[PDB]
Amino acid sequence: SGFRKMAFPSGKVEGCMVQVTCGTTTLNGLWLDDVVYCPRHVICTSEDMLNPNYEDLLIRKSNHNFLVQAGNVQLRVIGHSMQNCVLKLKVDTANPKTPKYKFVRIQPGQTFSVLACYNGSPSGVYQCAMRPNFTIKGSFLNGSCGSVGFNIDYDCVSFCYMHHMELPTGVHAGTDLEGNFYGPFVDRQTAQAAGTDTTITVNVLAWLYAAVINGDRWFLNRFTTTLNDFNLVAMKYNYEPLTQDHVDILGPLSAQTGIAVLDMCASLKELLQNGMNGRTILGSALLEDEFTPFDVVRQCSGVT
Amino acid sequence: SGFRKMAFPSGKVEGCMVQVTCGTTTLNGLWLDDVVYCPRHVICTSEDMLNPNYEDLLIRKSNHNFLVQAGNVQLRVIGHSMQNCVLKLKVDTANPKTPKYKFVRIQPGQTFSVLACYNGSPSGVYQCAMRPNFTIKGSFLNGSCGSVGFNIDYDCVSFCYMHHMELPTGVHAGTDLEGNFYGPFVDRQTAQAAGTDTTITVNVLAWLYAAVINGDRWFLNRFTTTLNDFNLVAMKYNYEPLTQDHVDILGPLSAQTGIAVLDMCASLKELLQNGMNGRTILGSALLEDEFTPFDVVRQCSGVT
Numbered sequence: 381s382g383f384r385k386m387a388f389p390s391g392k393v394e395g396c397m398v399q400v401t402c403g404t405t406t407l408n409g410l411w412l413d414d415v416v417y418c419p420r421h422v423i424c425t426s427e428d429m430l431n432p433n434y435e436d437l438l439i440r441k442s443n444h445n446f447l448v449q450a451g452n453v454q455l456r457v458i459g460h461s462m463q464n465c466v467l468k469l470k471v472d473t474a475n476p477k478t479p480k481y482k483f484v485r486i487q488p489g490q491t492f493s494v495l496a497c498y499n500g501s502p503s504g505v506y507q508c509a510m511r512p513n514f515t516i517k518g519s520f521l522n523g524s525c526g527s528v529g530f531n532i533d534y535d536c537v538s539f540c541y542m543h544h545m546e547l548p549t550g551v552h553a554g555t556d557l558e559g560n561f562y563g564p565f566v567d568r569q570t571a572q573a574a575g576t577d578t579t580i581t582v583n584v585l586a587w588l589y590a591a592v593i594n595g596d597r598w599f600l601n602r603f604t605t606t607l608n609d610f611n612l613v614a615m616k617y618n619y620e621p622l623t624q625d626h627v628d629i630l631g632p633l634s635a636q637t638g639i640a641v642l643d644m645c646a647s648l649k650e651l652l653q654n655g656m657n658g659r660t661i662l663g664s665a666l667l668e669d670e671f672t673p674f675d676v677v678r679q680c681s682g683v684t
Numbered sequence: 685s686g687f688r689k690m691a692f693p694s695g696k697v698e699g700c701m702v703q704v705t706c707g708t709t710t711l712n713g714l715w716l717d718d719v720v721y722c723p724r725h726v727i728c729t730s731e732d733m734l735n736p737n738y739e740d741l742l743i744r745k746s747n748h749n750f751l752v753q754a755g756n757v758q759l760r761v762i763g764h765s766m767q768n769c770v771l772k773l774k775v776d777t778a779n780p781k782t783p784k785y786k787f788v789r790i791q792p793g794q795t796f797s798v799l800a801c802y803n804g805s806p807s808g809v810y811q812c813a814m815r816p817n818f819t820i821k822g823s824f825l826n827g828s829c830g831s832v833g834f835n836i837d838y839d840c841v842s843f844c845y846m847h848h849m850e851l852p853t854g855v856h857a858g859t860d861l862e863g864n865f866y867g868p869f870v871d872r873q874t875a876q877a878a879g880t881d882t883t884i885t886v887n888v889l890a891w892l893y894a895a896v897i898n899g900d901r902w903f904l905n906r907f908t909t910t911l912n913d914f915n916l917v918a919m920k921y922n923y924e925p926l927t928q929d930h931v932d933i934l935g936p937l938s939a940q941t942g943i944a945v946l947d948m949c950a951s952l953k954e955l956l957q958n959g960m961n962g963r964t965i966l967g968s969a970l971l972e973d974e975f976t977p978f979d980v981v982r983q984c985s986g987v988t
């Protein structure tokens with residue numbers, strides 16, 4: 381019973397958080413095995429940030445300039461290298477709390493949990509989605525850079541995001557753990573406007589299936605539609621076009637509820653065209669798009 | 685930048701989760717020091733649940749009937765006792781992962797994080813509020829009983845909730861860690877309807893302050909009100925009456941934003957009377973009441 385915006389248990393990630401200081405800048409690092417991963421802008425001063433030449437800035441840095449602290453103990457830095465927009469600090473000690481892990485570059489529409497950190501210490505955990513415009517709508521303040529996004533499959537943590545910056549519009553941009561930004565964003569204090577933040581249609585349908593499973597059914601109607609007819613409505617409302625891959629991914633939810641994907645699309649079509657009329661769905665007065673079909677199945681089945 | 689429904693990092697609690705089995709029932713336990721805490725209905729069969737006599741059922745149970753497993757290793761049970769609606773299983777080993785902790789009985793309107801577990805394994809973490817009718821709107825399936833609610837102050841975990849049951853209305857009831865239910869609920873499969881779920885007014889105002897801090901200001905108006913005038917509106921909309929204690933608790937948010945509490949009440953009054961007119965606040969189309977004034981300050985300052 382019930383449906384919540386649920387994050388993964390953060391323990392395995394908390395054991396990887398460290399504090400990295402270079403000069404006067406302190407941010408978060410991720411310690412996995414004998415490597416600490418952190419945003420390369422840790423080497424920048426506020427003045428450098430307008431147009432930084434990271435290769436030139438990094439020349440003036442030695443291993444001893446990178447202060448890495450895990451809890452209250454200091455890690456010895458024996459190597460440093462820049463991989464895209466991340467720094468990799470080789471330390472002399474493997475993290476004893478290193479979980480089984482992978483680095484994954486997620487697709488827009490996919491969700492993940494963020495462990496927001498400051499000075500290497502966890503402050504909280506929440507669930508995010510990579511927006512179709514490659515931004516994330518997070519909760520981060522100065523000092524949160526280096527906080528990571530991740531998913532967990534039983535005992536394996538798949539790291540997918542590392543926080544780097546806030547855009548002037550209050551949305552967030554970052555990289556995968558290879559240091560490549562999601563989207564066109566660059567790690568410099570410059571005019572970087574975000575593209576259209578469209579709604580993740582397959583996720584809204586998954587959340588509608590979750591609502592039916594949990595008893596909220598008022599929005600079910602007597603109608604059906606086609607992918608092409610639905611997509612005309614989706615375009616008008618800045619929803620992502622629905623494909624047969626999306627319909628296929630909703631198959632288990634359609635099978636569990638007995639509601640054909642195209643019938644659910646027709647409920648969504650009427651919801652887009654007529655609104656909620658002051659009503660709610662799973663305690664929300666808008667269509668929620670940050671639950672994937674996998675999230676709905678996981679939460680509705682209790683995968684640990 | 686940004687505002688999210690954030691849970692505490694769950695690591696300290698994950699290290700306390702164990703599986704408790706008695707006969708054919710398996711649920712979650714909380715292992716702190718040499719004691720495992722779990723819902724006493726672990727001793728019940730589905731038939732017992734209609735009208736169980738826990739004292740009589742517990743007579744037929746010995747220490748060896750309580751199977752306690754921490755990960756893949758078995759704990760030896762050397763004692764058992766019933767305290768209200770919880771069982772306390774004394775084990776021969778102190779939990780080496782026991783964090784600094786307290787047991788607290790929270791007040792309605794207060795928030796906490798839940799680590800949903802199944803078979804002693806964490807599935808996810810989310811933020812809840814104890815509703816004014818003493819229910820929680822969680823996400824729990826069969827096997828989740830014994831999952832706990834908690835708050836964290838730096839290194840101290842204050843446990844406040846232990847999940848016991850789902851009401852026929854899909855809302856959740858449970859106990860504090862002394863086994864006393866929140867509200868009038870009893871641990872038996874019987875007609876237990878919930879009272880009026882009123883809105884936590886002080887929390888909605890705190891969330892309105894969070895919105896102003898984060899840039900969402902469209903709802904600020906040219907009006908003010910009084911506590912008595914505001915409370916006439918609050919009664920009409922099933923909002924909790926606002927007191928001077930609530931105004932005092934909003935003091936830091938009022939000081940940070942420069943918006944007097946009664947002016948914010950007048951914005952809330954107009955929002956209640958006229959609705960959002962298709963607009964959103966912090967990505968929500970309804971007034972959010974599961975952020976306390978302390979939560980807003982914590983999130984907006986980055987307390988770790």
Ligand SMILES: Cc1ccncc1NC(=O)Cc1cccc(I)c1
Nearest residue numbers: 421520521522545546567568569685
């Ligand atoms: C202040 C804040 C809030 C949330 N998340 C991150 C930050 N920090 C920054 O963005 C600092 C910064 C400034 C300009 C460019 C770059 I690269 C980094």
Ligand SMILES: Cc1ccncc1NC(=O)Cc1cccc(I)c1
Nearest residue numbers: 381725824825826849850871872873
């Ligand atoms: C099925 C479920 C879903 C969510 N949270 C908890 C549960 N489990 C129960 O409530 C089992 C139960 C039944 C009747 C009385 C009692 I005491 C306990």
